Design a protein around this nucleic acid. Structure first.
Lengths: 58, 101, 138
RNA sequence: AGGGAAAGGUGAAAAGAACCCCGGGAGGGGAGUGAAAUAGAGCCUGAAACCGUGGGCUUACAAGCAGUCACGGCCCCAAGGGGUUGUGGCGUGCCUAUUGAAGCAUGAGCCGGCGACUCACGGUCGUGGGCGAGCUUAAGCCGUUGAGGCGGAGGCGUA
RNA sequence: UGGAGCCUGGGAGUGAGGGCGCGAGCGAUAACGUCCGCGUCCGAGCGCGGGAACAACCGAGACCGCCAGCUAAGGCCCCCAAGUCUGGGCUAAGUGGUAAAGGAUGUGGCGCCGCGAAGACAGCCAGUCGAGUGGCGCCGCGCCGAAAAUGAUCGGGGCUUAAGCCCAGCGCCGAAGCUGCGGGUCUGGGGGAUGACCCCAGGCGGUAGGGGAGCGUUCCCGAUGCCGAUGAAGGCCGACCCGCGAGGGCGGCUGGAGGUAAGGGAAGUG
RNA sequence: AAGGGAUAACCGCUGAAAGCAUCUAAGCGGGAAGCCCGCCCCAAGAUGAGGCCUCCCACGGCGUCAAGCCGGUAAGGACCC
């Protein structure tokens, strides 16, 4: 889960370390590394989550 | 539509009508639960906090059931220590009814 | 269930050449490509990395004073069968070898590890004598 | 002088396979007896090691206490199972003996069967009952023929 | 209020210890050496994470299950999960990647002393020359001193404004530890129509041993009975059902005459 | 062994840090029966299985349609002697 999340979110600018910290502050106790298969099905919606994440991050 | 509900200490991706198993609920035989525990949709909802305020997913309970048996068995050498135990985790099956967020 | 799992997609090819670059600092990323570790199909048991062609080998920068000082080694199973050959002499003849050795070491060591080392094509160049694609990365 | 084994079993009944066929014979193949002949004669049942034939999966750039977890392919009844194993993760045999053993320390080729905390009489705690300031009989005698009675010599206890 | 304590009694094993830290003796301020003393871990936690590999160094005391979440030591360039993350310095030996007396204008940072228009510190008659010159002494990092026997290597590749060393800062990865959800068993506590069923809270690594529950084998009473050729015992198969487990049912083929409940009793009992 | 290239101790050029001097700190030359290649031998299972010369080519009959198909060929190759 982690190896491919990293691959996917590294494809938008940032890295895994950063992405998870973001979500933490962003208040989305969600992804559940399991359920970041969103990266493969519906990357539309992954993209959204990355925005929220870098929202709390920069 | 989509939806990412939470039950049994774990999370899942549900849709109009299917389900698998999920852990004993204290839920009587043929009745109906709402799993207000719910994040995300198929129109890009997300969740300002953990939960999306006005949101839920309806499902109907089909019944309970014990899993396939697993043998847990321990051994330590040069010591005559061996142990055999038989294990079966219980579950419940749902039927997803609709996603009203 | 959640087996995210791939289905076989068409393998991509790539051309690259940091002819002006520090090897190791090059070879690292090459390998990360030879495994599908950049793409979120990643599946550890299968081989869906990129095919990789590297033009213009030799030319590579090597830090510090690593000529005569970096020594390469081969032992035949015989008495006194040790060979010690320094970096200078490897570029001098068989420089395609240098970047090859360096990537080998960064690849896993199973059968699948040898399969990926075959996906890596190295030419002291330029001119990579096979044309049928190559989305060059810089 | 002395030591000293192994080895039991067709079927209710021999009705124990005339006759034909291949073979020197031994064996078989038809036929026939029988409820049954993988009950056909060191013949009831016929387990395991061990040796064959046929079929599915699988292997000639690999590397191992031989398995396990995960994907993936093929093969057989169906949204689930069973068989097999390509790749990937993880993994120092059992027993004994020892401060310490995968150990290059002991034992064991493999399978089956035999194989080691008992009984008597005292003793001492515990415990389920009987009767209690008392409780209890031994040898024997009378009955039963898988019936129980009687018998206070004695013994423990009451300083 | 603790798997604390004290009193009386039944059952033991042990009486060969080992490493580490600290305090002494012996030894040579030698030994995986040896003697005692205080503590720990292995023993019995060769179960799990870190340490390349490795009983006792660091992290941590493993009832079971989950394709959930947070951490610990140690880690985040690839092999290998996570920063080629940010800001300031040092080092050019691959030091790092394991050695001393003693040597050296290696470097970088501090010194406080000579004496410089009685303008020689370095150079050719002292005039020109027109300025920085020497002197020990501290601190950081490195250099020589450095020769052993099968093929080499910091675990490997490979690293030089670092992937080394020093000092800050934020973030992630990471165990069988801690949370989340479900289940078991044992205690304690609640109900108290004691229901042996519902609710709550703790405990459950384990060698020598102590204690508690069960399962199965042979035989006896139950028996002048009950099952049995419409198939006993035994044998061969199963992905099914019930038990935590030893086990017990169910079904199909084989076998051809024996088998024996509920509840109890003996022992040539695994 | 000739021979060609790179080196060890060691011998030099040019040259500052440090107006002098210094083989060195940027550079450049000499220099061993030793190192590399050269001589002789093995070698494409070098699963990274190489290259050059010459030859032989037809579907003839059937499945999840190029053998995973059986039976005759071709250039060739075995068997027996």
């Amino acid at each position: 889960w982690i190896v491919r999340i990293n691959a996917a979110c590294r494809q938008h600018g940032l890295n895994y370390s950063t992405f998870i910290h973001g979500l933490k502050k962003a208040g989305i106790e969600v992804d559940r590394k399991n359920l970041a298969d969103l990266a493969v099905r519906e990357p539309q919606v992954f993209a959204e989550l990355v925005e929220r994440a870098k929202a709390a991050q920069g | 539509m989509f939806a990412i509900v939470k039950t049994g200490g774990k999370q899942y991706r549900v849709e109009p009508g299917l389900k698998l198993r999920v852990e004993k609920l204290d839920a009587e035989p043929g009745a109906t639960v709402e799993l207000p525990v719910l994040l995300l949709g198929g129109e890009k909802t997300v969740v300002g906090t953990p939960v999306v305020e006005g949101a839920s997913v309806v499902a109907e309970v089909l019944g309970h059931g014990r899993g396939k048996k697993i043998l847990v068995s321990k051994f330590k050498a040069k010591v005559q220590y061996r142990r055999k135990k038989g294990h079966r985790q219980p579950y419940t099956e749902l039927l997803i009814k609709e996603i009203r967020g | 269930m959640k087996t995210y799992v791939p289905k076989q997609v068409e393998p991509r090819w790539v051309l690259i050449d940091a002819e002006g670059k520090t090897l190791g600092r090059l070879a690292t990323k090459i390998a990360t490509l030879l495994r599908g570790k950049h793409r979120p199909d990643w599946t550890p048991n299968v081989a869906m990395g990129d095919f990789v062609v590297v033009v213009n080998a030799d030319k590579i920068r090597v830090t510090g004073k690593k000529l005569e000082q970096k020594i390469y080694t081969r032992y035949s199973g015989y008495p006194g069968g040790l060979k010690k050959i320094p970096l200078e002499k490897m570029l001098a003849t068989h420089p395609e070898r240098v970047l090859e050795h360096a990537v080998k070491g960064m690849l896993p060591k199973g059968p699948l590890g040898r399969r990926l080392f075959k996906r890596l094509k190295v030419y002291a160049g330029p001119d990579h004598p096979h044309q049928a694609q190559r989305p060059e990365k810089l």
